[PDB]
């Protein structure tokens, strides 16, 4: 990554062993559950394109997702080139060349070129742009790998209401959708898919019950 | 977060892998026991609003609580805008814009804007304001997840007084996230919910009792 140093200057630092091992482990333990996307963004703070590629390449399994991810990156790279084409010409001594889509993805650029763009004034943040594409790709994978549709999330007979509600909003997170959808869906399926012992209680609470009030109300069913 | 470096100047630092794992793990192991609120506050020392959102977003389970937390944050954002509305106008070269409720929550602000507010003179501490809102939300969750009402904590016949008292103040701690009178209920219910042989001893103690003196008496 690129870090602040003790003086004001921005310098390169090797990716740390702690971060690499942490990323490999979260993938092993959580696969492509939605919470992995935030962790990736935090672990890749300040990353060069090289560092981001290392993190993705150290994943051993899930090669279908990884190959699918490569496809999404290439689609975004092509769109970059179309909206920001490279101005062709002889390069002036000491001036930077213009990054192509493939340079941002770290495939045809060197570490020194990547550092050059990121430390320019004004900075050309090839690392931050690539991370955007990777996160766009991971979002698609989490949605594909969501195992259950909310329509199939129904409260079990002995299941505590908190656990059904936990499952409900976890599925919504992978499904992502929108906030309008998340609030329309709650006003609908959460009550109908509730257990009958809880359903009677939730129905008796009346209209306008908060999520907080229903979970307190239903703490007796066990 | 924003920290002081070896020179006097305040610079941004990446959230550490150690801190992120620590927060994820304490939630997995301890859930919403009251002591998690301290831990969050310490782990979020110097945090930007982005960092606070990162910590909350990396939590995988407990999505009911997280959705409840979002409601509390949104409620707090509206009150911020109502008491500190944004003065509208063209922005002067090199001056910062005024933060809205959504900017404090890290939804509509950039990292650089967050850093700008936190390091200004005078500082606009958007990180500290957001952390307060999050803690208000977490307090409600801890209380909701309190498994027992204080009224139902009663000493077993074979339970050492120390173990009952440990359970008693833990439950009291979960209700209202401590930060209460902590005195009216104590002078009353702790004795009434004591075991029968101990209750006679506690009743016999008389007015004024230290926690220390009563536990010794019932040893």
């Amino acid at each position: 990554p690129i870090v602040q140093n003790l003086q004001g200057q921005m310098v390169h630092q090797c990716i740390s062993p702690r971060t690499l091992n942490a990323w490999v482990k979260v993938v092993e333990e959580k696969a492509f559950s939605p919470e992995v996307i935030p962790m990736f963004s935090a672990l890749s703070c300040g990353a060069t394109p090289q560092d981001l590629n290392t993190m993705l390449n150290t994943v051993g399994g899930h090669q279908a997702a990884m190959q699918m991810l490569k496809e999404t990156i290439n689609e975004e790279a092509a769109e970059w080139d179309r909206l920001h084409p490279v101005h062709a010409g002889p390069i002036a001594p000491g001036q930077m060349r213009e990054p192509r889509g493939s340079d941002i993805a770290g495939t045809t650029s060197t570490l020194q070129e990547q550092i050059g763009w990121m430390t320019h004034n004004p900075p050309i943040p090839v690392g931050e742009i690539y991370k955007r594409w990777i996160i766009l790709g991971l979002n698609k994978i989490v949605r594909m790998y969501s195992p259950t549709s909310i329509l199939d999330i129904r409260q079990g007979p002995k299941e505590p209401f908190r656990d059904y509600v936990d499952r409900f909003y976890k599925t919504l997170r992978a499904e992502q959708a929108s906030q309008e959808v998340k609030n329309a869906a709650t006003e609908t399926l959460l009550v109908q898919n509730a257990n009958p012992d809880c359903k009677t209680i939730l129905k008796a609470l009346g209209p306008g019950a908060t999520l907080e009030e229903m979970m307190t109300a239903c703490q007796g069913v066990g | 977060p924003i920290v002081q470096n070896l020179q006097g100047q305040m610079v941004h630092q990446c959230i550490s892998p150690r801190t992120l794992n620590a927060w994820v793990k304490v939630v997995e192991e301890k859930a919403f026991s009251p002591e998690v609120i301290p831990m969050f506050s310490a782990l979020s020392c110097g945090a930007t609003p982005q960092d606070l959102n990162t910590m909350l977003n990396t939590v995988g389970g407990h999505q009911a609580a997280m959705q409840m937390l979002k409601e509390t944050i949104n409620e707090e954002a509206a009150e911020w805008d109502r008491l500190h509305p944004v003065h509208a106008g063209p922005i002067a070269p090199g001056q910062m814009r005024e933060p809205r409720g959504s900017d404090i929550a890290g939804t509509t602000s950039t990292l650089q804007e967050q850093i700008g507010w936190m390091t200004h003179n005078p500082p606009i501490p958007v990180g500290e304001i957001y952390k307060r809102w999050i803690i208000l939300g977490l307090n409600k969750i801890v209380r909701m997840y309190s498994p027992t009402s204080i009224l139902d904590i009663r000493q077993g016949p074979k339970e050492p007084f120390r173990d009952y008292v440990d359970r008693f103040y833990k439950t009291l701690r979960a209700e209202q996230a401590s930060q209460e009178v902590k005195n009216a209920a104590t002078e009353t219910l702790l004795v009434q919910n004591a075991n029968p042989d101990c209750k006679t001893i506690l009743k016999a103690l008389g007015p004024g009792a230290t926690l220390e003196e009563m536990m010794t008496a019932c040893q």
Partner: nanobody
Amino acid sequence: DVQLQESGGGLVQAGGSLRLSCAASGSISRFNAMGWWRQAPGKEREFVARIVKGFDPVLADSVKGRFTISIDSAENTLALQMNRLKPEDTAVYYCFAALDTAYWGQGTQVTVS
């Protein structure tokens, strides 16, 4: 198991006040939520009041200004103080309490005019 019974209801004229009371078995602090619903002859059941543990009382909009709901743990009773009574208030009033599913009283008839 858990038994509920409303009482204190009857027929009063317009502009009067009345207090319904619902007696519960066991301790009332054990319930996680209680409230009041009503049904008038031929009309569908309408929601009147709710109190959930730890929360402020919530009242229906047609009654919000006029009714109050309270809980007395000493007498183990749930009170709905109907005040400023109107003709639309003629109905049967029910209390409910929820512990591991909900429970209803038999109702009390209230007729205003």
